[PDB]
């Protein structure tokens, strides 16, 4: 009585969750855009009416691919660069004590060593200023990396400044974007659109603080895979940025040492003037009221009369226990103990100064046996950044006590990438469909 | 009421419209299915996209639906698939929900369209032999 027959429709708007390889788009630098397609001057966003889509930022394969891409770009930017195998020699080091403050004592070593020249049968006695964090005593020292691997000097012309990178789906795939503000990254997004490329995401490498990122448009956003599991990192996104001013004030002198035919090692010559500590400044009132916002949003998950406490990082590597970042070629590791030091009970112009230590021997990603040497930067260096979020870790939390304690976390850059890709997902279009219709062929 | 004609909702703009309404925008989805280590992953992606497009085209063509976007067939609608007579499919549901409802019923239909098309080719062969 129905008299219904199979009918094939091609071009149907249906999609499935898919994993594919996205490609790069962008408008000397590590984040190589010489292999990235030009971005469209007028990108097209298609706002999908009535589409309620399932999103999950914690299983997003875009994050994994982007992590791989960033690591590969870092690796290939270091390949045509000087391998500092000759630098693994015995160093004769003394203390730098000419115009140092009390907090820079023992932090710099004046190390003389024998080095190869362009002629295979000649040696040169040279010297360099090294950081206490980069040398280990055997008055005789060696570079920290020399019992693990040889180090590759970063090519001085290559810039470390992040450039925005757009991620685009290939043919047959679409990037679905969640336009829902107040979205916490997991569950159904009822306001969905389609984009051919993601927005410009800067590969900002940092720990304990997300810098130069995107802000929430409504209020501070708390995002955890499982908020009641204290082994899961909490990602905090600010609605208003916090300005952080980081300086290395030393007037550094770079000298170039010919260690082989066409091979230069860039040593630190001598600091012109006073030697004093690198640091970062954060506005005290801005940070205080931002933490008030974070506390008000954490109470929604951890009780309305609970005590919310911020404390120091527990321990581990210097990368994870400090706000570690990169300020114009130099690698800072700042003690964020004045930031996360407070308790919150339910009921001017000064600033917080975070002392920072510089390093030249860098292990960027959580890898061992693959290290990078940062050449010294000529002159004083100063940068200004926006803190747009936090990576926190909740402490213990048994039912014994009513105080919740949060400590800065980080180390894994996938959480940094997840804070920008939380509202994106990749799907593959399924154009073929079969339906009942009255026609017969 | 009064109208001023058809509009353009974009690449997947009809994904939330009814199946009848979304059946009017098939070409829109159709056209955007085709377009030293990152010259390799890119090339693998392009080869894959071409391969899936060609698999879909071959699957259409071995059903007698070659060159068509809507293709009514000779295979009847076995009601063990779906019991919704028509008013609650084309005017009250979207293609995503329908695919949710028949992803468990797909491959058998594809094989049936295949064998029916081969039957048709042979019957046409016999007809033209007279």
């Amino acid at each position: 009585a129905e008299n219904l027959w199979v009918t094939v429709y091609y071009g149907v708007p249906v999609w499935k969750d898919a994993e594919t390889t996205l490609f790069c788009a962008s408008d000397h630098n590590v984040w190589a855009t010489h292999a990235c397609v030009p971005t469209d001057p007028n990108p097209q966003e298609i706002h999908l009416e009535n589409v309620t889509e399932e999103f999950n930022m914690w299983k997003n394969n875009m994050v994994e691919q982007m992590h791989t891409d960033i690591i590969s770009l870092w690796d290939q930017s270091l390949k045509p660069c000087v391998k500092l195998t000759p630098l693994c020699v015995t160093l004769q080091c003394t203390n730098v004590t000419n115009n140092i403050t009390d907090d820079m004592r023992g932090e710099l070593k004046n190390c003389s060593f024998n080095m190869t020249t362009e002629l295979r049968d000649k040696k040169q006695k040279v010297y360099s200023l090294f950081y206490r964090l980069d040398v280990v005593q055997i008055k005789e020292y060696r570079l920290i990396n020399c019992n693990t691997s040889a180090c590759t000097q970063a090519c001085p012309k290559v810039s470390f400044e992040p450039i925005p990178i757009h991620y685009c789906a290939p043919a047959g795939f679409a990037i679905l974007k969640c336009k829902d503000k107040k979205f916490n990254g997991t569950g159904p997004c009822p306001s969905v659109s389609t984009v051919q490329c993601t927005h410009g995401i800067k590969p900002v490498v940092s720990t304990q603080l997300l810098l130069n990122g995107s802000l929430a448009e409504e209020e501070v956003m708390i995002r955890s895979e499982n908020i009641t599991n204290n082994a899961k990192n909490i990602l905090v996104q600010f609605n208003t940025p916090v300005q952080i001013n980081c300086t290395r004030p030393n007037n550094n002198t770079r000298k170039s040492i010919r260690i082989g035919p066409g091979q230069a090692f860039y040593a630190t010559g001598d600091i012109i003037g006073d030697i004093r500590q690198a640091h970062c400044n954060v506005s005290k009132a801005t940070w205080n009221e931002t933490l008030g916002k974070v506390v008000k949003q954490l109470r929604k998950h951890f009780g309305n009369n609970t005590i919310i406490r911020f404390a120091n990082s527990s321990g581990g590597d210097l990368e994870v226990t400090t706000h570690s970042f990169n300020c114009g070629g130099e690698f800072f590791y700042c003690n964020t103990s004045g930031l996360f030091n407070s308790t919150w009970i339910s009921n001017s112009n000064d600033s917080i100064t975070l002392p920072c230590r510089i390093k030249q021997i860098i292990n960027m990603w959580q890898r061992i046996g693959q290290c990078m040497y940062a050449p010294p930067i000529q002159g004083v260096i100063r940068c200004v950044s926006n803190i747009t979020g936090l990576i926190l870790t909740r402490d213990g939390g048994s039912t014994n006590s009513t105080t919740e304690t949060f400590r800065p976390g980080g180390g894994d850059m996938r959480d940094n990438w997840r804070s920008e890709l939380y509202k994106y997902k990749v799907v593959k279009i399924e154009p073929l469909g079969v339906a009942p219709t009255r026609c017969k062929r | 009421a009064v109208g001023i004609g058809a509009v353009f909702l974009g690449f997947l703009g009809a994904a939330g419209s009814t199946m009848g309404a979304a059946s009017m925008t098939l070409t829109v989805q159709a056209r955007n299915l085709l377009s030293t280590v990152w010259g390799i992953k890119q090339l693998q992606a392009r080869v894959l996209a071409v391969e899936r497009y060609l698999r879909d085209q071959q699957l259409l063509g071995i059903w007698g639906c070659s060159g068509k976007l809507i293709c009514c067939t000779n295979v009847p609608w076995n009601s063990s698939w779906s019991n919704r007579n028509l008013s609650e499919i084309w005017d009250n549901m979207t293609w995503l929900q329908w695919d949710k409802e028949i992803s468990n019923y797909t491959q058998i239909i594809y094989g049936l369209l295949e064998e029916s098309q081969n039957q048709q080719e042979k019957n046409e062969q016999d007809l033209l032999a007279l």
Partner: antibody, heavy 122, light 107 residues
């Protein structure tokens, strides 16, 4: 998320021409027919016309025909209303309004612009 | 041009009362009527479309009824943000026209 933003206010002499712009955000520009309406101070609304942003077709209210022109640019998701030969009776607030446009026919103006004051006086 | 006429032109009522506002059309508009709310110095809001369908994001106290030439908009329990101007607008045939308007004010 659907917003229509119009250009700034205009003060013109009689017999001049005015150009009201209207840009769309939060929805596909070519997916809904766009109305133009005007309200005089303390009076009711007067519907001027509407345009199909996809094809470019227009319909003007017959008493405005040959004097007001509707155009759109898709590259910037914008619609332009040109009101020519202005007189003091043209003074009022000009609105661009997205239509719900179900079934390719007028259903209702659900998104409205913030309005553009156009004052005509010697 | 089709004429829409609304009753009252002006009305005073208190919070919690019911208001019924009547729009009459000179010609037939089957269900092609929309009810809009406008407040001082601001663009109107779509309340009703199809003469009986409530716009998404509108409180349920708003309701409309009628087909053809006679339509009534009812707010069952008034609220201090509902005191504003109201328009009825048909779109059956050109030109689309709006009603004269009803201004509801608190007593």
């Amino acid at each position: 998320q659907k917003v229509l933003v119009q250009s700034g206010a205009e003060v013109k002499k009689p017999g001049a021409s005015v150009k009201v712009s209207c840009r769309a955000f939060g929805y596909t520009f070519t997916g809904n027919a766009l109305h133009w309406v005007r309200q005089a101070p303390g009076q009711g609304l007067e519907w001027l016309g509407w345009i199909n942003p996809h094809s470019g077709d227009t319909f003007t209210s017959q008493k405005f025909q040959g004097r007001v022109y509707m155009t759109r640019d898709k590259s910037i998701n914008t619609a332009f209303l040109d009101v020519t030969r202005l007189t003091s009776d043209d003074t009022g607030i000009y609105y661009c309004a997205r239509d719900k446009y179900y079934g390719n026919e007028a259903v209702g103006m659900d998104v409205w612009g913030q309005g553009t004051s156009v004052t005509v006086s010697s | 041009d089709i004429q829409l006429t609304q009753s009252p032109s002006f009305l005073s009522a208190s919070v919690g009362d019911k208001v019924t506002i009547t729009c009459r059309a000179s010609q037939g508009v089957r269900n092609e009527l929309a009810w809009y709310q406008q407040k001082p110095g601001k663009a109107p809001n779509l309340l009703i479309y199809y003469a009986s369908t409530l716009q998404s994001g509108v409180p349920s106290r708003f309701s409309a009824t009628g087909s053809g030439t006679h339509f009534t908009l009812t707010v069952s329990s008034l609220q201090p943000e509902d005191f504003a101007t109201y328009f009825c607008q048909h779109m059956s045939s050109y030109p689309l026209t709006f009603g004269g308007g009803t201004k509801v004010e608190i007593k």
